[PDB]
Each structure stands twice: as structure tokens, then as C-alpha cells.
Ligand binder design. Structure first.
Ligand SMILES: CCCN(CCC)S(=O)(=O)c1ccc(C(=O)O)cc1
Length: 500
């Protein structure tokens, strides 16, 4: 049993802590890269630029007013003061708060403001692609080698996106940066669990969710001192150059080495760690024959989830839970400008509510159960988003509190759905089901920017859609069975026995 070798070579020793911390460090900037468009693509107030030949009645005579008493964003009078025409001569952007964003740089306003959501959608497309493309590559080149490439790719793509000359190049490199960063998080949990004892896997999963939470604090601080979008994009990308330098000293997972049929590589990795842990004597006792004897016992397809009728309803129901959680999450954390409060304050509060929300989730999970915790978190998040759309924008304090509560509930749902998925699937398909569930989360983060484009015609439509989906997801949770206090299933037969 590989757990016995891990315990023999040191268990949770110096090497485990060092490698875990080094590997989990990029998760701090993971959130910054995920939600950078809140600050690099912020929309400042804008209006039609008056004609160059005309002399500034003044500016107020050239801009028609709206119902709220503000100049129209993309309408100007043909003659000074009533025929209105779009901004042929460009827009004038208020630089009091945002000196320059991709919206002001390339005029992604009005007839072109849908390009702002397309850039975020394309970045999440790379995140989905990186999960699938680099997931297969990790199983061939190893988790360490792929992590070295991902640090280089993120630094190069992030720097290149900062120096992008036009919109097309920015979208391509944002997609490329997402590909490596998606596998950075995936290979961070994979490489960590293979070097850590089975009884401490829950700590790794909890820690990764934590490091993502303090990553939201970092983005608000970084974006505050670095308001320019080109500098902000570059600043959050150059640390991966440093991570690339020290990633050469990582130790490849010994479990993967055995799966590749290379026991000599497995033995050297185990002996090297025991040197670090201070157990050279036990490491010297290990031999190639001993590894074969211990790992002999250790040594289904993704289409099985759609073939077995019992597994079908588990895969379908869990997919909606994964989709709706991420679909509503990214439709809410990527709309920080509508609450009437400073965006840096909202980002700080959004990351601050994560800590009590996950703490409350563990209390509810252990007390009432996984299913009531999943229903309550999704239903409350859906209700909070729905009420947010109904309430007028003038209630900045009330609307912010509902968004913060909804964000906390959605973050609560993310923690519960990860634990719920592990205890639902049998051990034969537990890893495949977890990967497929995370895939649907990435799909939800792709469709969410597309739904946000519907604010062109119906301003309240995205909020209604972002809120209605979690409500339906809470209903579909009732079909799932409660797993609190129940033994973990091993085969498909255990699933039928529990249902019967
Ligand atoms: C399975 C990946 C989920 N994600 C969506 C991918 C597009 S995620 O962005 O990486 C994320 C979000 C929030 C939390 C949390 O606060 O618990 C953790 C992870």
C-alpha cells in the first residue's frame, strides 16, 4: 500500500510542507487571473466626442440627456442646441478612477460592448481547453514537467496579453494564459495528493479553497495600486516567471511513476524525500523488489456515466449542480460595478465572506447533512440573486448585502458540491466523476459571460437567468441521496443496494 511507503519515508514531513506550499503559491494569483476583467475591462462613464471642426453652446449642447439626467453614452445631436447620431468621432472616457482599460483602449462600448464579455468567455474557453488538453498531457509527461511548462506559458501569455497591440491578439493570449492556469490548479491538487497520506487529503482540498479565497484579497490590493490595465495584466503575470525558476526543483509524484511502469524512478523519488525528511535509514532500506511487493495490489471509462442507468441519474443531477453553481458564481463575481460601491471594496468583501461561508458549510454539512446543505446554499443563492434584480439600483447597501450573501452561498455550494461528489460516485468512477463535474463548472463559466450579453436589450434579463438556474438546481438536489453517515460505495452494485 502506497500509504505505507509514504508513512515509512516520513509521512507529513518537511518535504511535504515545502512542496505543498510551493505548489499552492500560484493559487493566490489564480483568482486574480480568473477575475482580472473586473479591473482591466472596467467601463468608465463615456459620451460622444463632439465634432473636431465644431467649436466647444458647449459640450452640453452636443449630448442628449437620458431619463436620469446623464448624457447619452453613444448619441449626439447632429447640430448644436433634434437629430441624434452615433459616436462617429469616438468617445470621451472619464479617467478619474480608471486611467485606461481595454474598454477605453479599443472602444468596446455600445455597439461593440459585447466584445468585453466575449474576451471573458474566450478566456474561460481556454480554461476548459486547458483542463482537457493538459489533463491528458500530465498523464504522459508527468505532473512536474507539465507544471514547469504551465508556469512559463502563463508568464509568457500574461505578459503578451499586456502588450497586445489589438483586441484579437489580447483574446488569443488571454485564451492561452487560461489554458495553463486551468491545469495549474488541476495539477496543484493532483501533485499534492499523490505526495500526501490518504488521511490528509481533505486538508489539501480545504487548503486549496482557502488559498483561492485569500487570492481575492490580493487582487483588490494589486488592482488598487496598479490601475492601468496594461500594467495590471503584466504585474499579475511576471510572478509566474519566478515560479518557473524554482519549479525545476520539484519532485515528481511517486504514484505516477509507478503507474508508468518505472519503479527505479519511483524508488529514487521515495529515497530522495526520506533524505529530506531525515529518514535516510528507512530510505536506504527501500529497494526495487520491496516496491514491487508493496505496490502489486495497487497496480471505469467516462462513457460509463451515460451507459449505466443508475450512474446516469447521478451524472445528470450532479452536472446541473456543478453547472448552476459556476454559472451563477461567475455571473455575480464578474458584475462588481453595478452595486454603487467602490469596486475594490466589493472585491475585498467578496473574498472576506468566503471564510465564514465555508466555515458555516462545514457546520451544516456535519449537522444536517450534505443534501440539506446543498439545497440551502443553492436555493438561498438563487433567491438572493433574484431579489437583487427586483430591487432598484438606488438601494446600494441592500443590493450589496444580497450580492455578498449570494456570493457566500455560492462559495458555500462550491465547497459542498466538491465533498458531495466524492461521496456519491463509487470508487471505480470517483475520479472520472469529479473531473466531469469540474468540466461542467467550466462550461457554466463559459456560458455566463454570454448570458451577460443579453443586458443589451433587457437589462434585468441576466440577473433573472443567473438567479433562476440555482433555484432549479436546488430542486434537482432532492433526487440525490443523502450520504452523511453512510459507507462509501465501491462498485455499481453498492449504488443499487443503497437505493433499494
Ligand atoms: C471546479 C472548479 C471551480 N471553478 C470554476 C472553473 C471555471 S474555480 O474558478 O476554480 C473556483 C471558484 C470558487 C471556489 C471557492 O470559493 O470555493 C473554488 C474554485
Amino acid at each position: 500500500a502506497f500509504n505505507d511507503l509514504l508513512k515509512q519515508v516520513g509521512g507529513v514531513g518537511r518535504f511535504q510542507l515545502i512542496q505543498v506550499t510551493m505548489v499552492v503559491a500560484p493559487l493566490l494569483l489564480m483568482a486574480s487571473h480568473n477575475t482580472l476583467q473586473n479591473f482591466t475591462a472596467a467601463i468608465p462613464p463615456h459620451h460622444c466626442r463632439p465634432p473636431a471642426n465644431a467649436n466647444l453652446g458647449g459640450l452640453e449642447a452636443w449630448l442628449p440627456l437620458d431619463k436620469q439626467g446623464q448624457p447619452e453614452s453613444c448619441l449626439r445631436f447632429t447640430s448644436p442646441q433634434r437629430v441624434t447620431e452615433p459616436c462617429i468621432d469616438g468617445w470621451v472616457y472619464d479617467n478619474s478612477t480608471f486611467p485606461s482599460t481595454i474598454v477605453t483602449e479599443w472602444n468596446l462600448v455600445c455597439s461593440h460592448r459585447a466584445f468585453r464579455q466575449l474576451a471573458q468567455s474566450l478566456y474561460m474557453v481556454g480554461v476548459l481547453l486547458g483542463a482537457m488538453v493538459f489533463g491528458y498531457l500530465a498523464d504522459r509527461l508527468g505532473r512536474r514537467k507539465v507544471l514547469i511548462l504551465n508556469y512559463l506559458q502563463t508568464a509568457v501569455s500574461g505578459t503578451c496579453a499586456a502588450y497586445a497591440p489589438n483586441y484579437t491578439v489580447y483574446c488569443v493570449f488571454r485564451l492561452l494564459s487560461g489554458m495553463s492556469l486551468a491545469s495549474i490548479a488541476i495539477n496543484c491538487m493532483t501533485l499534492n495528493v499523490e505526495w500526501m497520506p490518504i488521511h490528509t487529503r481533505a486538508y489539501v482540498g480545504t487548503l486549496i479553497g482557502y488559498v483561492y479565497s485569500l487570492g481575492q484579497f490580493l487582487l483588490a490590493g494589486i488592482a488598487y495600486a496598479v490601475p492601468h490595465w496594461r500594467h495590471l495584466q503584466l504585474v499579475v503575470s511576471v510572478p509566474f516567471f519566478i515560479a518557473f525558476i524554482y519549479s525545476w526543483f520539484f519532485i515528481e509524484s511517486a504514484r505516477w511513476y509507478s503507474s508508468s511502469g518505472r519503479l527505479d524512478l519511483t524508488l529514487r523519488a521515495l529515497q530522495r524525500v526520506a533524505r529530506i525528511n531525515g529518514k535516510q535509514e528507512e530510505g536506504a532500506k527501500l529497494s526495487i523488489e520491496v516496491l514491487r511487493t508493496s505496490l502489486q495490489k495497487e497496480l471505469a471509462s467516462a462513457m460509463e456515466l451515460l451507459r449505466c442507468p443508475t450512474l446516469r441519474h447521478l451524472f445528470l443531477c450532479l452536472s446541473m449542480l456543478w453547472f448552476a453553481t459556476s454559472f451563477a458564481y461567475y455571473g455575480l463575481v464578474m458584475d462588481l460595478q453595478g452595486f454603487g460601491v467602490s469596486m475594490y471594496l466589493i472585491q475585498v468583501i467578496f473574498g472576506a465572506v468566503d471564510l465564514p461561508a465555508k466555515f458555516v458549510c462545514f457546520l451544516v454539512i456535519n449537522s444536517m447533512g450534505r443534501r440539506p446543505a446543498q439545497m440551502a446554499s443553492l436555493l438561498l443563492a438563487g433567491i438572493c440573486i433574484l431579489v437583487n434584480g427586483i430591487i432598484p439600483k438606488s438601494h446600494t447597501i441592500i443590493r450589496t448585502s444580497l450580492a455578498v450573501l449570494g456570493k457566500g452561498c455560492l462559495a458555500s455550494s462550491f465547497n459542498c458540491i466538491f465533498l458531495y461528489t466524492g461521496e456519491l460516485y463509487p470508487t471505480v468512477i470517483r475520479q472520472t466523476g469529479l473531473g466531469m463535474g469540474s468540466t461542467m463548472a467550466r462550461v457554466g463559466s463559459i456560458v455566463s459571460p454570454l448570458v451577460s450579453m443579453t443586458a443589451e436589450f433587457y437589462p434585468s434579463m441576466p440577473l433573472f437567468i443567473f438567479g433562476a438556474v440555482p433555484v432549479v438546481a436546488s430542486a434537482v438536489t432532492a433526487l440525490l441521496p443523502e450520504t452523511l453517515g453512510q459507507p462509501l460505495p465501491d462498485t455499481v452494485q453498492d449504488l443499487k443496494s443503497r437505493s433499494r
